[PDB]
Design a protein around this ligand. Structure first.
Ligand SMILES: CC(C)C[C@H](N)C(=O)OP(=O)(O)OC[C@H]1O[C@@H](n2cnc3c(N)ncnc32)[C@H](O)[C@@H]1O
Ligand SMILES: [Mg+2]
Ligand SMILES: [Zn+2]
Length: 776
């Protein structure tokens, strides 16, 4: 054993030892329990930096821990290669997106290999390769013929800087997710996934996820935004039906989220384009001028119609008003009004002298009918509501439902803030949409045998429009239904399509007959442990659950949920500079910020490895903070981690130098001195603590600190006697195994100096319970 700790000697040798043994190349082996640990794969939008390294080191620690515990561990890595991240970085450097992506991938592979992650590289995927994206094209066509994917014109989010439409989940505070530019509204046909068909299942199945952070589930619940409401039909008065036809001559229908206030409705509003408004305006120029002023176009305005509808629950004849705040096409185009319990209706009734019937009371408060007081749903009881008096909200809801159901005048209706997922992008670098437009047959999907629709890679966009719409050699084709002249779709799929199913592709990444093979899907099931940032809560983490249910319903998988456990690691943060983002190693001082290529404050892992070794980089990331807490970059933290590794190396070197290796102490410890019994007590207490920290608490910094304390007590114990050396051997053999998930290169090397067996076959250290009993 050499005296000096030299990471450049031992880390390549350890990595070759692990690669040769193929311990990370796993098959569907039915003898060991499976463990699927996955970190969110990166965009090839530049060099990885230490923030990514923290993400992936956390995954490796958990993978290596489960490996030593006898699991068949799949930890796969790959490249989220399509979409704006890679393309925007390529265009900034005048490089074609394809060439830029593949070169970035190869540098990112060398970075990760230098860090010694226990990755099954034989499962590597690159999402921009046709062997990958053909299968999402296949799924697209299958869902298109079912109507789960559809094309429709509509109002969309337009990003004027990235020059593409964006999904709702990609609009962050009204700004594009990559550009930061203020979003605009346009009318543009897009392709949609009917994710609202799965809104209820997406919402309810969150309750299954006992091992997700509550915050992620809460954000998804609010994004889905379910509201249980009530459809209510008001019978049109017999004297108020002139000019109307069909249902509009019979009833006026509205949707409301407060049917407990239905007994308090004092008037009703309709949109200017509602058939009741147009029928009432036919005989009166009073309303036509208001409908014209409304159809032209915020402050609330309204006019009475003289038409009346009948409240189904008490028979009150409410007057119909035309109001500029009632949007047509939004629902029924009509609403009821409860001013005493809705602030908007209170203002409308105050501005136009409309009654205010109180129907809810909160505790012991009075009702001043001319001053709005702060609409409580949770704390409230009904008054002036017939047999509804005394009922709280949820009981009044179901009671009103039963009442309306008995007369055919209404029924419960659930709505969601979630809208359908718009996936069309006016971008070159993305999965081609497998549609051909035929003048005779319409928008037709490409046959399965003709898939993939191959994206040409010989393209350098100029930044002025969709490049594919500019290439007749791409879009001119034949219709697959009739053989006439036709045009391929030239929009591509948003990059989140690829990340919504890549975790299944890892299970069988060379499978040529489908997205994922039935045998491998049945073996691996779902991801046991997922690690990635909280920024994915409303988009990827929601999209992925949706795709999983889609693929399940197509018969491709048999799980309901893609990810069992989710760890959202904290951000690595670092100082930033701008002028034009500079890097600290090389103006303005924009202050401490998340490490990101977008701010050019990333620390390259390869440079730290070249100066200090991969084990140092890994150790600092796991020791500096609990994994969910943000971690501030620090040179002294790097140096402190390196000194500990020198201490570990020096500790074993000095032990071996004074006698060499002996057999570790084991068995009954009666006869050991008290100092050595205390050391064994600390040793096995530390094994229990580390085991619990890796497994149950997932707190790796305190695991490292526990091992440091064991070494502290070791240093203060005289271990030079024969029994001392056996206990020293035991301490050091446990210590390097406990730390191997964190710093495997130095622990593998030290293990081989201590013991001739293979570390991963000696397994995880066991707790000797007899060592934990205190002496009398
Ligand atoms: C599943 C896909 C939609 C993922 C997508 N391709 C993506 O986000 O790719 P990206 O390459 O941006 O990030 C890859 C992973 O690294 C984490 N990460 C990045 N910066 C930092 C940081 N400063 N501190 C800690 N962690 C960080 C980030 O949260 C993510 O889990
Ligand atoms: Mg369960
Ligand atoms: Zn045709």
């Amino acid at each position: 054993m050499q005296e000096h700790y030299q990471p450049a000697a031992i880390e390549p040798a350890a990595q070759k030892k692990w690669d040769d043994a193929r311990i990370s190349n796993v098959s569907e082996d039915a003898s060991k329990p499976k463990y699927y640990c996955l970190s969110m794969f990166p965009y090839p939008s530049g060099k990885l930096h230490m923030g990514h390294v923290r993400n992936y080191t956390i995954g490796d620690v958990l993978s290596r821990f489960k490996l030593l515990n006898g699991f068949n561990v799949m930890q796969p890595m790959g490249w989220d290669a399509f979409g704006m991240p890679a393309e925007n970085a390529a265009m900034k450097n005048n490089v074609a997106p394809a060439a830029w992506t593949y070169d970035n991938i190869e540098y990112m592979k060398t970075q990760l290999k230098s860090l010694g992650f226990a990755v099954d590289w034989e499962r590597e995927v690159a999402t921009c390769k046709p062997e990958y994206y053909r299968w999402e094209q296949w799924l697209f066509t299958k869902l298109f013929e079912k109507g789960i994917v559809y094309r429709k014109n509509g109002t969309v989010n337009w990003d004027p800087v990235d020059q593409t439409v964006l999904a709702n989940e990609q609009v962050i505070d009204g700004r594009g997710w990559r550009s930061g530019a203020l979003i605009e509204k346009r009318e543009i046909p897009m392709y949609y996934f009917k994710i609202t068909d799965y809104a209820e299942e997406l919402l309810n199945d969150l309750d299954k996820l006992e091992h997700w952070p509550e915050q992620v589930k809460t954000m998804q619940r609010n994004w889905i935004g379910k509201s249980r409401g009530m459809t209510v039909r008001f019978a049109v008065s017999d004297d108020s039906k002139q000019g109307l036809e069909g249902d509009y001559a019979k009833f006026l229908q509205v949707y409301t989220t407060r049917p407990d206030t239905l007994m308090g409705a004092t008037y009703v509003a309709v949109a200017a384009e509602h058939p009741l408004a147009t029928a009432a305006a036919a005989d009166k120029p009073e309303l036509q001028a208001f409908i014209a002023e409304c159809k032209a176009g915020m402050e609330k305005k309204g006019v009475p119609t003289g038409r009346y509808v009948v409240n189904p629950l008490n028979g009150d004849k409410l007057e119909v008003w035309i109001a500029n705040y009632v949007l047509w096409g939004y629902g029924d185009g009509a609403v009821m009004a409860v001013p005493a319990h809705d602030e908007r209706d209170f203002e409308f009734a105050a501005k136009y002298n409309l009654p205010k019937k109180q129907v809810i009371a909160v505790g012991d408060n009075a009702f001043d009918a001319n001053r709005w007081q702060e609409g409580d749903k949770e704390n409230g009881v009904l008054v002036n509501s017939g047999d509804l008096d005394g009922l709280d909200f949820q009981t009044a809801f179901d009671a009103v439902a039963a009442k309306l159901q008995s007369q055919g005048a209404g029924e419960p209706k659930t709505q969601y803030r979630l809208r359908d997922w718009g996936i069309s992008r006016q971008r070159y670098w993305g999965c081609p949409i497998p549609i051909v437009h035929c003048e005779k047959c319409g928008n037709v999907p490409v046959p399965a045998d003709q898939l993939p629709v191959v994206l040409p890679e010989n393209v350098v966009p100029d930044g002025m429009g969709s490049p594919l719409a500019k290439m007749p050699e791409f879009y001119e084709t034949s219709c697959p239904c009739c053989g006439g002249a036709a045009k391929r779709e030239t929009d591509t799929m948003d990059t989140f399509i690829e990340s919504s199913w890549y975790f299944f592709r890892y299970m069988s990444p060379k499978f040529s007959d489908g997205m994922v093979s039935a045998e491998s899907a049945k073996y691996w099931g779902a991801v046991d442990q997922y690690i990635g940032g909280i920024e994915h809560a409303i988009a990827h983490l929601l999209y992925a659950r949706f795709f999983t249910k889609l693929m399940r319903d197509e018969g491709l998988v048999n799980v309901d949920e893609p990810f069992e456990r989710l760890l959202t690691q904290g951000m690595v943060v670092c100082e930033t500079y701008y002028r034009d983002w500079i890097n600290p190693a090389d103006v303005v001082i924009s202050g401490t910020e998340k490490m990101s290529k977008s701010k050019n404050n990333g620390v390259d892992p390869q440079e730290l490895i070249n100066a200090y070794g991969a084990d140092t980089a890994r150790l600092f990331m796991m020791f500096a903070a609990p994994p969910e807490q943000s971690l501030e970059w620090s040179d002294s933290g790097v140096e402190g981690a390196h000194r500990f590794l020198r201490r570990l190396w020096r500790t074993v070197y000095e032990y071996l130098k004074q006698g060499g290796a002996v057999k570790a102490f084991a068995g009954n410890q009666d006869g050991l001195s008290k100092e050595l019994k205390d050391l064994r007590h600390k040793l096995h207490s530390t094994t229990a603590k580390v085991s619990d920290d890796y497994g149950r608490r997932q707190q790796f910094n305190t695991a490292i600190a526990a091992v440091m304390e064991l070494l502290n007590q070791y240093d203060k114990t005289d271990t030079g006697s024969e029994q001392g050396r056996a206990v020293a051997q035991e301490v050091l053999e446990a210590a390097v195994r406990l730390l191997w998930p964190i710093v495997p290169h130095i622990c593998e090397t030290l293990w081989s100096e201590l013991n001739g067996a293979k570390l991963w076959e000696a397994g995880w250290p066991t707790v000797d319970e007899a060592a934990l009993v205190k002496s009398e």
